[PDB]
Amino acid sequence: PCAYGLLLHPTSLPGPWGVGVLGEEARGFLRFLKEAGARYWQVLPLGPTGYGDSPYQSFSAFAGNPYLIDLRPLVDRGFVRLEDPGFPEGRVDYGLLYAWKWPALRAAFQGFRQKASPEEKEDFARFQEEEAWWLRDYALFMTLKSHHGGLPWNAWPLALRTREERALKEAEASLAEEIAFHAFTQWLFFRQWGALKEEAEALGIAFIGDMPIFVAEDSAEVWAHPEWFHLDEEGRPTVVAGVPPDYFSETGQRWGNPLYRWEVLEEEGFSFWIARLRKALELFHLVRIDHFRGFEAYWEIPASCPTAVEGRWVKAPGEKLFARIQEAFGRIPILAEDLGVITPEVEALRDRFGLPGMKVLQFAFDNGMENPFLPHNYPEHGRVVVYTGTHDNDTTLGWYRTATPHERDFLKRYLADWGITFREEAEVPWALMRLGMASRARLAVYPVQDVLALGSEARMNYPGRPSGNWAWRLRPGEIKEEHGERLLSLAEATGRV
Numbered sequence: 001p002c003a004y005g006l007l008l009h010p011t012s013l014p015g016p017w018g019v020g021v022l023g024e025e026a027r028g029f030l031r032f033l034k035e036a037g038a039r040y041w042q043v044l045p046l047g048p049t050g051y052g053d054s055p056y057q058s059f060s061a062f063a064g065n066p067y068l069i070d071l072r073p074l075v076d077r078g079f080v081r082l083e084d085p086g087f088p089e090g091r092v093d094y095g096l097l098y099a100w101k102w103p104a105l106r107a108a109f110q111g112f113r114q115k116a117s118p119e120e121k122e123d124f125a126r127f128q129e130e131e132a133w134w135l136r137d138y139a140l141f142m143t144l145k146s147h148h149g150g151l152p153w154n155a156w157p158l159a160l161r162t163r164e165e166r167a168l169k170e171a172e173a174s175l176a177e178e179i180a181f182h183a184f185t186q187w188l189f190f191r192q193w194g195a196l197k198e199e200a201e202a203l204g205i206a207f208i209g210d211m212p213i214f215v216a217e218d219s220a221e222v223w224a225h226p227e228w229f230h231l232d233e234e235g236r237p238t239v240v241a242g243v244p245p246d247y248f249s250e251t252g253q254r255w256g257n258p259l260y261r262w263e264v265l266e267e268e269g270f271s272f273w274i275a276r277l278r279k280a281l282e283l284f285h286l287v288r289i290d291h292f293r294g295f296e297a298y299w300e301i302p303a304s305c306p307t308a309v310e311g312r313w314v315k316a317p318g319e320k321l322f323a324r325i326q327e328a329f330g331r332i333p334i335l336a337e338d339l340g341v342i343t344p345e346v347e348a349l350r351d352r353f354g355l356p357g358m359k360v361l362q363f364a365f366d367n368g369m370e371n372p373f374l375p376h377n378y379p380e381h382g383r384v385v386v387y388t389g390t391h392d393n394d395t396t397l398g399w400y401r402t403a404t405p406h407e408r409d410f411l412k413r414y415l416a417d418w419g420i421t422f423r424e425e426a427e428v429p430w431a432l433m434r435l436g437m438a439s440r441a442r443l444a445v446y447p448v449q450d451v452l453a454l455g456s457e458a459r460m461n462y463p464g465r466p467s468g469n470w471a472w473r474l475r476p477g478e479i480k481e482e483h484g485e486r487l488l489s490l491a492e493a494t495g496r497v
């Protein structure tokens, strides 16, 4: 029973200009966290997003999401003048945010080139030089994507798709301004996050980052390093990621993400992963990795297959990779997302390296006392993270409302065994958060929607649903001291303060 933190993607922060940003409201959430006894702030992947707006399908495994840039500081410097397009409240309007914030950032870039001090123009220069190894490909990637009507890289003219030496240099020369712009967006993002990170550290708060084990097909790194992935000559994946048919899905899941050529990454001492983790550790203190099981083995699906039925398991060099990580960083600040159908082999790898696993209370009541998500079954070392629900789950109140008769009843009886009782429906989220903090899990993390006991409309992501995801936002003044105080109380009572 060491500590607890809260889960809130930066986009959910309240504030003007269409979305949560790395500014004052963000710093405000830090104070809230501090005064609430919280010691962790978990977020979703922070890279640039494409269609669907999912943080797990980023245009780059290294880049930073421009949408998170707080335009206010840039306004205070005279680089740009802002006028609101009519953004709504409590939700992100991505369509509108795209049409507005990009030109907004572009305009602010012109202000910078004409009013930036030497120390500013110099810093921007150092940044471009130091992050060049990935920044160069990223900036050109985005630029070329705009220049081609948003077409995916493997749909661009042969010369550019195959990254021919000449074509690249020419494009890189006749679009140096757009390329500089994108680099500018990155410069702001990392500098703004950096400030926020130091802030959190001074308050004694650690950041729990996130990253999908597999990258997106249409992204800077796949374009610039196709040797690391199973692609044909046209740049199209010959096999895609996914999971096999299980008790639930009768056809399994076909994600479409490109699969790694593990043999190639190994011959290079897993350079990609080390670089990927090094860059994440610049932003986070702990890094959760989605679909951890992939390091043990992954389900390879023929690209020509419409479902996941035709796949097969393929072992991945997990042991070697983590051994390498251990030596590279002298530690392994990884957080294993081991939800779903896991095997003894996956647990073996996870445990063998002392990596903490996950526990989701919303999944603990559809069976009997042997459910590994029920608190009494948590490993004695308590090296695990308990959640009421994650971003992919409905809010706890929303889950409760639709849960089966068995789950609802078992929930009550189980809570009772722990001296926890509830009357009102809106009380459920707190009963579970309480159960979480009372457990052996050294760390408990809760999404803010549960702290506010919001219903299903505040659900961050609904797997399978083709819209309305990643949009939920706290409304101004919605979260209040009242909530922080109640959390502090619960944390003190369980010894997590």
Ligand SMILES: O[C@H]1[C@@H](O)[C@@H](O)[C@@H](O)[C@@H](O)[C@H]1O
Pocket: 001, 002, 003, 496, 497
């Ligand atoms: O490392 C320490 C230790 O575990 C303490 O018993 C307590 O839990 C602290 O908060 C921290 O976690």
Ligand SMILES: O[C@H]1[C@@H](O)[C@@H](O)[C@@H](O)[C@@H](O)[C@H]1O
Pocket: 023, 024, 025, 027, 028
């Ligand atoms: O007020 C805002 C923010 O909420 C924090 O208080 C930060 O430290 C600054 O004061 C900022 O201007």
